[PDB]
Design a protein around this nucleic acid. Structure first.
Ligand SMILES: [Mg+2]
Ligand SMILES: [Mg+2]
Ligand SMILES: [Mg+2]
Ligand SMILES: [Mg+2]
Ligand SMILES: [Mg+2]
Ligand SMILES: [Mg+2]
Ligand SMILES: [Mg+2]
Ligand SMILES: [Mg+2]
Ligand SMILES: [Mg+2]
Ligand SMILES: [Mg+2]
Ligand SMILES: [Mg+2]
Lengths: 143, 78, 514, 88, 183
RNA sequence: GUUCCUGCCGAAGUAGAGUUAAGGUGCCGGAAUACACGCUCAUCAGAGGCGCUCAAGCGUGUUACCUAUACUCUACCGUCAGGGUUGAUAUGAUGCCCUGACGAGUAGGCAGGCGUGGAGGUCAGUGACGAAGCCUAGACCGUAAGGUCGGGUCGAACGGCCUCUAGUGCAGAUCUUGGUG
RNA sequence: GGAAUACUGCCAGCUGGGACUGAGGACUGCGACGUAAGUCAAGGAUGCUGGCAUAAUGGUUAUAUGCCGCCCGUCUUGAAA
RNA sequence: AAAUUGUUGAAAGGGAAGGGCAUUUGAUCAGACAUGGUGU
């Protein structure tokens, strides 16, 4: 109170806007392969592990397969393909949002590779990048 | 074609891009009427003021902390 | 929010003089920031006592630099004050980075000499941290140039320029390419409206900025050559615009763009700069780069003088003529100026009899650029125009008053003058022109009698430059005349100033009783 | 190749400089154009960003809004349309 | 779909071809027109003759250029740019003689003009209005047709080679396994 | 003859989004050179320009599509109407605030602003450190008539404000005169 | 005989993608749900993430190169013509 | 005093001076957070 209020302070009206947990798109499910459309790893195929509280999807390359480390990715900048891997092998509880502010990636990668081996040619798929060739129309293209 | 529908909003009317309404000032006494309304108003020295008076007005305005719209006019050009 | 108390400032100063810490410096600087931003805008500190505020200002400006130096003592290297490498320096550097624009606000709000000196000194002891920034070092040199440009106190201007020299000569790398730019840009846009009051001040500004260009022989050449070229662009734009038919911008009255005081201020400042750099002693038998800019400057000035041969702008011609005479005096370059003067001697003012005689005040040829349309075709204006013209001839032909080439520099002029004198109707003009004619013939005879005893030919430049080195220039018939005339002019200007000064004194008396 | 977009042409204005008409390759029907709604447009060095708003006509031309309107000299200029924000 | 499109002028109508080309140019596509002397116009020979006259450039290419410029707002910056994008020629000059040339179906005379309706050939019009070069172009065209017959023979041989290569690829396994699995 | 700008009432509005009438979907130009029928190409074919002839000509139906002073919602500006507000308002109860309706309008009529002079009163107004007048493809303000400032020009006095009183820019003809062929 | 489908109509039935608007500034009301306390999508947008400047860029001016227009009034479309 | 005519000087240009449009190359000017605090 060391200064009397010069002019006046207009208090903001109370806001009836409570934040609620996000409702993700139906295609996104744990163990779903993803295509990243921007950033350092744009056009690179990655695996989906879990959805964080702050609405940043968590993804692993695996770094072993394609050199993409554990990372947070925005959901809207990602395409979801119809091919899946079982994520039950990897537990994915410890690492969280605040944690993001090598050994863990190795632990995750061993379990995820274990499931990757069963499906044919999946490692090659995750290794290679994606791009649009001439004559490719996305709207028909089933991803 | 001019017409009333083009009229500007009252809350934004008569406002410079700096956000200060321009008020004409002739002498120090008229400057002092804008002592606290520094946020709402900015002073503008009249065209007919002599150079000797303009420096005094500018000094008093700086002391009061009132924005002058046209300083360095007739003390500098443009 | 902490409130400033006379206790708190006393404690901060108490622990400043013994064992300060970065926390204390940030606290002091934040309080200082509030203090300087009270009128112009969250803040941790509140100020209520004038004693506490004054004490804060005092201790800050006079001792926060001292503590800053003590924490991070700079070392003199090759004449420059340079900080060392270390973590503690970087922390202090951010602290000075948090003090700098409070100093800037003080600089922009200077109103008197002593406050200017204090702010400039405190700023002086904080260069070595602020040389690392360019939003601050530029605005610093931009602000003090602003003070050097807008102050009406000659002492404040002297303090600002002394600061500019002292800081510039130490470092020369970050600032010098900006000091020159800011000063000459002052002479372009933020130029002071001319009047008998501002003449000594603007003369000091020019005589001061001239020295800065001369310090760095090469870099000055880099700067001025660019800026003079800017003038040429305007010069070329107006010539084409007037001459061509295009109705783009002011075909008929384009003179307004180039026939302005700011432009004449420019061309005078450049002559002063080149004259300063090209002086024989500073030359010291060593060529300087600035001499090569003499030719561009002369071409620009001559191009400006001839762009209008109208009476309304004869005062403009006279000022640039004096500038060219100065340049030739200092550098020794041969400027042809008589063709211009004799070319004006066909005008309607130098030739036709006066029409009106309202008995107005005499025109201030020294301190004006324009006739104002009331002095046109008047007895006073003709009588003053000729008064200037005759003395300008006296000066120009007094430059070579003691040279061996003066006879043949005089012959074509005496013949043409007698042609004009014999055909001119105005009696007073013929009397004045006559005087110069006989004195020119007299000095021609003087030089002839002194040259009849010479054994070396024109090719021997060494001896030609030695001719009458024993004789003073003022002892020649044209010197002894014109020197006296200069006094009869100089005294006049003095009695103007020693008059105008009193007018203000008298004016002051009135506000005492108001 | 590293292309993750389709380079499309800017046709003209709505006729309104604010709205622009964009022709995108391999899109014959409005139904095909419905996929591209909401995608980011980038005219390319300087870049101006925008988005696809809604379809325009039966030929598959779409409307587009940029943060600053196009200078009107780019009618027929190449323009990029990215896949993000993806809805698939 | 190509950096440059070469359109044959034969059997096309000046208005429809010009409109289509102008629309393409305004979209940035670069188009070059060749063999414009044999361009077609609907109506009778006299009417087109007097139309070009009441306009009164004699060459067919220039007539096509005028017809196309009538579409484009040439006085604007955009129209000028569209105009430098265009190219028009009588006969095929080099190097486009070595490049295949598309047809615009919308402007084809065979698909547009009804049998038993008088039309006019632009070459005859241009010659009648004072274009004294229809003769030299015809011989160049005949030489071009001889070269094109040789090229057609070469293309037939190339197609036979392509058939042999396609047969060779058929008896390879990997393509057959891929097709059965997918694609 | 016309009658500074804006607004209002009335015989016989601004901006964003969507929808839609009349129309239109070869290009200029935004929309299918879409469909489905009957026709017609005639030396009178047949419709802004270029152009069109199994039409880009007709009549007859189908959808799709483009979009306006039209309709809906929102925000804004105005006029109108209904209201709230004093043991006093955080700014002239002729103030501030809330809510709603309308804005085409011909004939006719009414109001509010801008500018020009006259007079009374007033700003202890402004002025050689530059008053008035004029210009200003400069900046700010107002929907506009315009206003303020900057600069130029100008070179000695004049302006702002309350009141009453006078009083807003163009067109064209008979021709006339001088001057030039 | 058994129904199905088509059409019309209703749903205070779910769920997805778009676009424009974010007007208001202490609280008050109708409400909803909460054992309750409190919370909310209920009388007009808040939250999270990233970057945030000698930049992003903006203005003025000058040449050369070519394209178009090119006596003036009226007229004209939407506009030169 | 305008309006008008003539000599001389400067510049541009082409048979008219002349504009608008596009490209080209340059020259030159303006371009904050002086972010409130804490920490070693
Ligand atoms: Mg003025
Ligand atoms: Mg509307
Ligand atoms: Mg609409
Ligand atoms: Mg209130
Ligand atoms: Mg009503
Ligand atoms: Mg009505
Ligand atoms: Mg009065
Ligand atoms: Mg005016
Ligand atoms: Mg405005
Ligand atoms: Mg919906
Ligand atoms: Mg010449």
């Amino acid at each position: 109170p060391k200064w009397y209020p010069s002019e006046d302070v207009a208090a903001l009206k109370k806001t009836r806007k409570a934040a609620r947990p996000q409702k993700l798109r139906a295609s996104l499910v744990p163990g779903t392969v993803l295509i990243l459309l921007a950033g350092r790893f744009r056009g690179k195929r990655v695996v989906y592990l879990k959805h964080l509280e702050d609405n940043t999807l968590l993804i692993s390359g695996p770094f072993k397969v394609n050199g993409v480390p554990l990372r947070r990715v925005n959901a809207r900048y990602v395409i979801a393909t119809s091919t899946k891997v079982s994520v039950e092998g990897v537990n994915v509880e410890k690492f969280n949002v605040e944690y993001f502010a090598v050994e863990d990636q190795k632990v995750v990668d061993k379990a995820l590779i274990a499931e990757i081996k069963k499906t044919p040619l999946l490692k090659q798929y995750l290794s290679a990048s994606f791009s649009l060739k001439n004559g490719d129309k996305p709207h028909m293209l089933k991803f | 074609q001019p017409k009333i529908g083009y009229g500007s909003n009252k809350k934004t009317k008569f406002l410079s891009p700096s956000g200060h309404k321009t008020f004409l000032v002739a002498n120090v006494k008229d400057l002092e009427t804008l002592t606290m309304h520094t946020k709402t108003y900015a002073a503008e020295i009249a065209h007919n003021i002599s150079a000797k008076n303009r420096v005094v007005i500018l000094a008093r305005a700086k002391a009061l902390g009132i924005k002058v719209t046209n300083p360095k006019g007739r003390l500098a050009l443009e | 929010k902490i409130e400033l108390s006379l206790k708190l400032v006393r404690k901060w100063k108490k622990q400043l003089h013994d064992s300060p810490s970065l926390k204390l410096l940030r606290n002091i600087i934040s309080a200082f920031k509030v203090a300087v931003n009270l009128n112009k805008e969250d803040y941790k500190y509140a100020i209520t006592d004038e004693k506490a505020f004054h004490e804060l200002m005092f201790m800050v400006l006079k001792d926060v630099p001292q503590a800053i130096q003590k924490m991070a003592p700079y070392k003199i290297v090759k004449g420059a004050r340079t900080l060392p490498n270390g973590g503690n320096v970087s922390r202090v550097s951010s602290i000075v980075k948090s003090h700098a624009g409070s100093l800037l606000i003080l600089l922009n709000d200077i109103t008197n000499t002593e406050t200017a000196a204090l702010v400039l000194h405190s700023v002086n002891e904080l260069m070595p941290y602020l040389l690392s920034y360019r939003r601050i070092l530029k605005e610093l040199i931009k602000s003090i140039v602003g003070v050097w440009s807008t102050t009406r106190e000659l002492e404040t201007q002297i303090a600002s320029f002394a600061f500019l020299i002292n800081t510039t000569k130490e470092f020369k790398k970050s600032m010098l390419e900006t000091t020159l730019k800011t000063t000459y840009s002052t002479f372009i846009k933020s130029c002071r409206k001319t009047n008998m009051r501002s003449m000594p001040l603007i003369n000091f500004q020019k005589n001061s900025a001239a020295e800065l260009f001369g310090i760095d022989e090469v870099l000055g050449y880099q700067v001025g050559f660019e800026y003079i070229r800017q003038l040429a662009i305007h010069l070329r734009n107006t010539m084409n615009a007037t001459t061509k038919k295009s109705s783009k911008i002011n075909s008929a009255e384009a003179y307004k763009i180039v026939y302005n005081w700011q432009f004449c201020h420019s061309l005078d400042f450049w002559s002063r700069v080149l004259s300063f750099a090209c002086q024989p002693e500073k030359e010291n038998g060593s060529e300087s780069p600035l001499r090569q800019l003499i030719y561009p400057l002369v071409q620009v000035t001559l191009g400006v003088i001839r762009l209008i041969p109208t009476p309304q702008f004869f005062p403009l011609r006279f000022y640039l003529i004096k500038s060219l005479i100065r340049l030739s005096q200092n550098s020794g370059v041969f400027i042809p100026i008589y063709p211009l003067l004799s070319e004006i001697l066909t005008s309607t003012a130098f030739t036709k009899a006066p029409k009106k005689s309202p008995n107005l005040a005499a025109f201030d040829f020294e301190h004006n650029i324009k006739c104002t349309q009331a002095y046109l075709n008047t007895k006073i204006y003709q009588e003053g125009l000729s008064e200037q013209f005759v003395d300008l001839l006296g000066d120009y032909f007094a430059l070579y008053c003691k040279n061996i080439a003066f006879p043949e520099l005089v012959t074509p002029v005496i013949i043409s003058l007698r042609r004009y004198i014999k055909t001119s109707t105005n009696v007073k003009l013929n009397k004045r022109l006559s005087t110069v004619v006989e004195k020119l013939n007299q000095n021609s005879t003087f030089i002839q009698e002194k040259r009849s005893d010479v054994e070396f030919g024109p090719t021997n430049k060494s001896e030609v430059s030695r001719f009458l080195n024993d004789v003073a220039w003022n002892k020649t018939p044209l010197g002894s005349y014109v020197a006296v005339q200069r006094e009869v002019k100089e005294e006049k200007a003095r009695l103007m100033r020693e008059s105008m000064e009193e007018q203000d004194k008298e004016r002051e008396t009135e506000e005492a009783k108001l | 190749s590293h292309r993750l977009y389709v380079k499309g042409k800017h046709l003209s204005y709505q006729r309104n400089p604010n709205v622009s008409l964009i022709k995108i390759e391999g899109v014959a029907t409005p139904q095909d154009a419905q996929f591209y709604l909401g995608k980011r447009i980038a005219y390319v060095i300087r870049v101006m960003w925008g988005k696809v708003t809604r379809t325009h006509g039966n030929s598959g031309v779409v409307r587009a809004t940029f943060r600053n309107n196009l200078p009107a000299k780019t009618f027929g200029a190449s323009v990029r349309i990215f896949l993000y924000p993806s809805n698939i | 779909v190509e950096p440059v499109v070469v359109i044959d002028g034969k059997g096309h109508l000046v208005g429809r071809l010009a409109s289509v080309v102008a629309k393409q140019l305004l979209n940035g596509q670069k188009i070059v027109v060749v063999r414009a002397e044999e361009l077609n116009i609907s109506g009778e020979f006299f009417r087109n003759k007097l139309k070009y006259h009441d306009f009164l450039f004699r060459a067919p290419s220039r007539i096509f250029y005028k017809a196309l410029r009538g579409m484009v707002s040439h006085k604007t910056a955009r129209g000028k740019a569209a105009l430098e994008r265009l190219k028009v020629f009588e006969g095929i000059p080099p190097p486009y003689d070595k490049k295949k040339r598309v047809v615009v179906p919308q402007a084809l005379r065979v698909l547009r003009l009804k049998p038993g309706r008088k039309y006019t050939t632009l070459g005859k019009l241009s010659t009648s209005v004072g274009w004294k070069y229809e003769d030299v172009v015809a011989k160049l065209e005949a030489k071009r047709k001889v070269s094109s017959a040789e090229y057609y023979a070469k293309k037939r041989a190339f197609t036979k080679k392509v058939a042999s290569a396609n047969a060779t690829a058929a008896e390879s396994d990997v393509a057959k396994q891929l097709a059965a699995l997918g694609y």
